[PDB]
Design a binder for this molecule. Structure first.
Ligand code: CLA
Ligand code: CLA
Ligand code: CLA
Ligand code: CLA
Ligand code: CLA
Ligand SMILES: CCCCCCCCCCCC(=O)OC\C(C#C[C@@]12O[C@]1(C)C[C@@H](O)CC2(C)C)=C/C=C/C(C)=C/C=C/C=C(C)/C=C/C=C(\C)C=C=C1C(C)(C)C[C@H](OC(C)=O)C[C@@]1(C)O
Ligand SMILES: CCCCCC(=O)OC\C(C=C=C1C(C)(C)C[C@H](OC(C)=O)C[C@@]1(C)O)=C/C=C/C(C)=C/C=C/C=C(C)/C=C/C=C(\C)C(=O)C[C@@]12O[C@]1(C)C[C@@H](O)CC2(C)C
Ligand SMILES: CC(=O)O[C@H]1CC(C)(C)C(=C=C/C(C)=C/C=C/C(C)=C/C=C/C=C(C)/C=C/C=C(\C)C(=O)C[C@@]23O[C@]2(C)C[C@@H](O)CC3(C)C)[C@](C)(O)C1
Ligand SMILES: CC(=O)O[C@H]1CC(C)(C)C(=C=C/C(C)=C/C=C/C(C)=C/C=C/C=C(C)/C=C/C=C(\C)C(=O)C[C@@]23O[C@]2(C)C[C@@H](O)CC3(C)C)[C@](C)(O)C1
Ligand code: KC2
Ligand code: KC2
Lengths: 228, 197, 218, 228
């Protein structure tokens, strides 16, 4: 079930290479949960990494260009052009912690059981479709829109178009992961990426440390701002 | 018979018996050896807890014989096995005279008889509420407490090894590699009863 | 009753969580009793902690805001840190607070009108009615502890159980909030978004009257 | 049974050489346990010696070249030039004793019967596969990974692949034993290895006497630690 699906997905993504699994990841048992859950976890990790990498490429382009949204909020404390690596070094520590908390809440909502069983689906490892973040149905407060399709413009999509979009998303996520990793490597080790030489500056801080030297504790708040 | 208990994993699921010993006598000799092993284990586990209390400077907030002048504070200042040499001279008498009373009762007052002839070794439960002054095991099933007795024997053997290591490290330096040198564990390495005799 | 414990929790946060206890205080026996008695005791303990926590959180907000009883003895102390206001109270005031609370819960333990105790089958967190048995109290007092003006009185049982669930959830949140405020009073840097508020404080919050022991060596 | 298997393994390892037993060690009962136990013990000893020798050769190359590890902070901070043998002469005696204890624990886990009956195997000198080790048996502390295959990347190999791997392991272990013994001889008696002349230094100590004059106490612990 898992291996045939993996081979079919590899053939659909690239008909020439096909099933290319060098380091035996198809049959690796993680915690004694058979091979179907291992393949589901690997597929979910690949899809999430590709989506996050495409978003990272878009965000890196936007931060390198400079498109600050407005005032009052955290954009007033970011410098007027400091490249992507130093962009996440001058934001407030409260803002970064709140962004991390929002990302964790989104991940927990995506991986929850009843929050996915309300949409008629199971967990990705336990025989489910990987990467399917469910819509808002049990968020207590009335949610305005869903997370996957906010405008609900893909309600008429067919299953074949959905499979084609999934294959395209996986391939584009892999390519964007390669591009973002190349930009990050050029930002630290010069001469790694040949095309990206001389475009982005050099960053001395570690890109693997999220809680590096803390940002300003200023709140930039007004109107009854009793919280210091 | 060498069916008994204490035979399990990490020894081949068979009796660990290089020298005869188990076949040195009969069934009663095995019961005496098991009672000695269990009593030795329990004494070693108690000594290990007391030694850990002594190293971490956990002493009573009392005085311990105001006539003599010894206090609980300077019984923890010295190392292990020297604190026993400083427990006045009546205190050793009282700790002792308490312990033969328990030994004499634990052998004598058995409704089934001594552990060699009727009654399992390591069972002074006829001393009412001596093992369990609270309940603790009061609703445990027999299959649970059999496994607990097996854990008792294994932990007793480990505690015997540990207290032998502690005595050796306090006596002969460099015997135990992980112990090596220590701020505490400085003393005679042994304690005679009543200090000197 | 480790089954109704799940029925209470299916309405707690949907099936998003349910019977969640990592160390499993359910299915316990405790002081020589049955699992049902322990379950009822734990439910009453949770409800009482929640009620005390909501009352304390509201009191902390009111006291730290500046609202204070003019009258006479409370006008003497002039601080802000609620804990320090308790510390600089007279000893008699603290003792009378403690003994009045003790009388109220002594009455709460007494079941002379309602047939079951909260461990023997009664509703957890149920304070018995004062005027239900008017010949078995030392002297008459009206204005019962729960619902002094009979505002609820006749209400649907669905509204009653919904209010019980709301009370439980609000109690848990107030427990977290008041412990956040106390840890703000003790540990700076802890509990973010509250660092700019609350005052530094010493004197082992979980101890009345005298002080100077503390968790200084953590 | 044991003699025929030994002859077949010798023929498979080297068709030209075949069986080479000049001392007649394949027929002597070492502990009075017939010939099958003696042959199994000899095969297990050969496999273990070859594996330890290959690990020692790789470690010799890595240590003589000089290398740090993940974090390190102590192991790769003490010596700069080690000349192989003195690398295990400046680390703490506690570290060397703990490494020896871990090796002994691994050997006891390999030789254990309760770890063998659970895995469906037997002892090497009682009619079992020589060199086979248990994965994790049941040690309460849940092992994150097994020992023979850490990533479980060899669970799909055929029996012929396993036999070829065993033969190649024996031959490569013999070659690595020759190389490690030559390096050790060149470290003590110059002119032994003609190719390795001058590559390795000279050491006054003996590598065959284990715990030599020990290293420092090496407290090496912090954050409220009162000893090593
Ligand atoms: C991949 C996730 C990701 C992460 C971690 C960040 C991280 C950040 N963004 Mg960002 N961003 C992203 C994706 C991301 N961005 C995408 C996909 C877009 C396009 C819609 C943007 C558009 C964007 C703008 C327009 C701005 C940021 C800004 C910031 C910083 C506050 C911080 C470094 C702000 C900043 O400091 O930039 C100067 C800011 O003004 N981002
Ligand atoms: C082999 C058993 C053993 C022996 C010989 C000792 C010997 C000693 N202990 Mg000790 N102790 C032990 C086990 C033992 N302990 C255990 C298991 C504990 C944990 C409860 C303690 C906890 C302990 C404290 C807290 C103190 C001592 C102290 C002492 C010293 C004074 C005698 C005294 O007051 O006894 C008291 C002994 C006990 C209360 C142990 C009784 C254990 C039995 C099984 C009943 C439970 C003396 C050197 C005192 C001292 O000055 O040491 C620095 C002291 O204040 N012990
Ligand atoms: C957990 C419950 C709790 C506890 C232990 C306290 C404890 C205290 N309060 Mg308090 N308070 C509470 C809830 C509580 N409050 C609530 C819910 C309110 C909002 C109505 C207030 C409003 C309040 C005021 C306005 C004042 C206090 C004050 C005080 C202090 C003096 C005792 C006194 O006169 O109390 C009186 C408290 C009550 C009559 C409320 C009864 C509790 C409700 C009905 C339950 C003492 C530290 C005084 C103080 O510190 O200033 C010097 C003061 O002036 N309290
Ligand atoms: C500690 C090391 C060790 C041990 C225990 C053995 C043990 C054994 N070797 Mg052996 N061998 C070793 C190192 C070792 N070898 C090395 C380093 C070489 C390379 C020179 C060889 C080359 C070798 C050959 C060529 C043969 C053996 C054979 C044998 C077996 C019978 C003798 C026996 C299992 C013989 C065998 O397997 O057939 C019985 C055989 O023909 N060995
Ligand atoms: C027989 C096996 C063996 C033994 C006894 C040692 C022994 C030692 N190694 Mg080592 N090592 C080995 C194999 C071995 N290594 C292999 C196969 C590798 C490759 C993965 C390494 C990689 C390695 C590194 C990277 C480091 C050591 C270090 C050390 C020392 C601590 C100690 C002398 C440390 C040291 O002190 O070297 C500077 C250190 O940093 N080893
Ligand atoms: C009032 C009190 C109320 C509670 C009473 C109460 O506490 O109950 C006491 C009690 C109980 C109980 C219960 O009944 C309860 C309460 C409820 C009931 O339902 C369940 C049970 C369980 C029945 C149990 C007691 C267990 C004990 C004492 C275990 C003690 C065990 C000591 C050891 C293992 C010593 C180990 C020594 C070591 C490791 C030393 C060492 C070494 C080496 C081994 C030498 C190796 C190495 O050396 C090298 C290589 O260099 C390192 C080194 C130096 O470290
Ligand atoms: C001592 C004999 C006890 C008799 C036996 C007994 O009753 O057992 C009970 C027992 C142990 C035990 C057992 C149990 C576990 C409980 C039960 C077991 O049951 C069975 C069948 O197994 C038996 C047994 C024995 O194992 C232990 C009892 C111990 C007891 C009753 C100990 C009194 C000390 C008093 C002292 C030290 C006074 C010091 C006084 C001193 C040092 C002074 O300086 C006085 C002073 O004046 C001087 C000289 C000059 C003055 O200017 C100043 C002052 C005024 C200060
Ligand atoms: C500076 C400033 O502010 O200027 C102000 C000053 C001042 C004075 C405030 C002003 C005023 C005038 C005011 C406020 C006049 C208000 C007078 C008022 C309101 C006087 C209440 C009497 C209550 C009685 C007698 C209660 C008996 C109560 C009894 C006997 C009981 O409790 C019995 C009880 O049976 C119940 C009833 C219920 C039963 O179940 C239980 C029990 C047994 C407990 C001004 C004019 O506005 C100007
Ligand atoms: C039958 C019917 O019709 O119902 C009727 C009748 C009935 C039932 C009798 C009624 C009643 C009684 C009453 C008085 C009910 C009210 C009860 C009350 C008083 C309930 C307080 C809760 C306090 C909370 C939750 C505090 C949370 C506090 C929280 C969650 C925090 O501090 C969180 C936080 O700290 C963290 C964790 C970290 C920080 O970085 C961030 C912050 C600071 C945010 C009603 C209302 O009249 C309705
Ligand atoms: C092992 C168990 C044990 C038991 C069962 C037990 C029973 C009783 C009873 C009966 C209920 C009494 C009444 C009693 C009384 C005193 N005990 Mg015991 N005692 C035990 C242990 C020790 C130790 C270790 C010491 C000690 C002492 C004293 C002193 C101090 C005398 C003085 O004031 O100086 C007094 C008054 C110290 C001592 O020896 O004095 C030199 C001291 O070191 N006791 N003791
Ligand atoms: C600090 C005091 C305190 C606070 C802050 C507080 C908050 C809330 C909230 C809002 C969060 C709700 C929604 C709520 C609801 C209910 N409360 Mg609470 N309550 C407090 C005190 C008591 C006492 C003393 C009793 C009690 C009860 C009930 C009943 C049951 C009525 C019935 O079943 O008829 C319901 C529905 C009685 C009881 O539980 O009886 C079984 C009872 O004795 N409450 N309560």
């Amino acid at each position: 079930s898992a291996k045939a699906d993996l081979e079919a997905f590899a053939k659909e993504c690239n008909p020439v290479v096909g099933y290319w699994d060098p380091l035996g990841l198809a049959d690796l048992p993680l915690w004694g949960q058979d091979q179907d859950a291992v393949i589901g976890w690997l597929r979910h990790s690949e899809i999430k990494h590709g989506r996050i990498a495409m978003a990272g490429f878009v965000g890196y382009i936007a931060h390198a260009n400079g498109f600050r949204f407005g005032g009052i909020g955290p954009q007033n404390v970011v410098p007027e052009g400091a490249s992507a690596p130093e962009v996440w070094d001058s934001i407030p520590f409260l803002a970064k912690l709140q962004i991390i908390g929002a990302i964790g809440v989104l991940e927990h909502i995506s991986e929850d059981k009843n929050f996915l069983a309300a949409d008629g689906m199971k967990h990705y490892m336990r025989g489910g479709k990987p990467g399917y973040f469910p819509t808002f149905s049990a968020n207590v407060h009335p949610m305005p829109l869903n997370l996957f399709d906010p405008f609900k413009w893909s309600k008429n999509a067919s299953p074949e178009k959905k499979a084609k979009g999934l294959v395209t998303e996986t391939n584009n996520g892999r390519l964007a992961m390669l591009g973002l990793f190349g930009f990050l490597s050029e930002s630290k080790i010069p001469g790694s990426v040949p095309a990206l030489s001389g475009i982005i500056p050099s960053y001395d801080g570690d890109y693997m440390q999220p809680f590096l030297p803390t940002g300003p504790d200023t709140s930039l708040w007004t109107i009854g701002n009793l919280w210091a | 018979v060498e069916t008994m208990e204490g035979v399990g994993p990490e020894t081949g699921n068979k009796v660990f018996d290089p020298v005869g010993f188990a076949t040195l006598g009969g069934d009663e000799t095995l019961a005496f050896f098991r009672h000695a092993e269990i009593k030795h284990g329990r004494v070693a586990m108690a000594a290990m807890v007391g030694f850990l209390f002594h190293i971490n400077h956990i002493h009573f907030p009392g005085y311990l014989s105001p006539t003599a002048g010894v206090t609980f504070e300077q019984l923890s200042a010295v190392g292990p096995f020297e604190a026993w040499n400083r427990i006045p001279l009546l205190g050793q008498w009282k700790i002792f005279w308490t312990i033969p009373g328990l030994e004499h009762g634990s052998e004598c007052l058995d409704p089934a008889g001594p552990y060699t002839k009727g009654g399992p070794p390591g069972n002074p439960k006829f001393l009412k509420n001596f093992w369990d002054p609270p309940g603790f095991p009061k609703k445990l099933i027999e299959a649970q407490k059999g496994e607990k007795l097996f854990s008792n024997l294994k932990n007793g053997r480990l505690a015997m090894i540990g207290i032998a290591s502690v005595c050796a490290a306090t006596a002969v330096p460099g015997s135990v590699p992980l112990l090596a040198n220590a701020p505490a564990l400085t003393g005679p390495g042994f304690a005679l009863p009543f200090g000197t005799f | 009753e480790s089954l109704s414990d799940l029925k209470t929790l299916a309405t707690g946060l949907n099936p998003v969580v349910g019977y969640w206890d990592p160390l499993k205080l359910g299915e316990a026996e405790f002081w020589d009793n049955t699992n049902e008695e322990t379950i009822g005791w734990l439910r009453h303990a949770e409800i009482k902690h929640g009620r005390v926590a909501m009352a304390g959180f509201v009191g902390f907000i009111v006291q730290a805001n500046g609202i204070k009883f003019p009258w006479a003895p409370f006008n003497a102390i002039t601080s802000t840190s609620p804990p320090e206001q308790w510390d600089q109270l007279p000893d008699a005031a603290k003792w009378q607070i403690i003994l009045g609370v003790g009388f109220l819960e002594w009455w709460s333990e007494i079941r002379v009108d309602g047939t079951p105790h909260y461990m023997k089958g009664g509703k957890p967190g149920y304070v018995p009615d004062f005027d239900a048995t008017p010949d078995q109290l030392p002297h008459w007092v009206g204005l019962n502890l729960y619902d002094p003006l009979k505002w609820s009185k006749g209400a649907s049982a669905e509204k009653k159980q919904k209010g019980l669930l709301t009370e439980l959830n609000n109690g848990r949140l107030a427990m977290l909030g008041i412990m956040g405020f106390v840890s703000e009073a003790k540990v700076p840097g802890s509990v973010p978004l509250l660092k700019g508020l609350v005052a530094p404080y010493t004197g082992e919050v979980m101890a009345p009257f005298a002080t100077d022991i503390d968790w200084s060596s953590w």
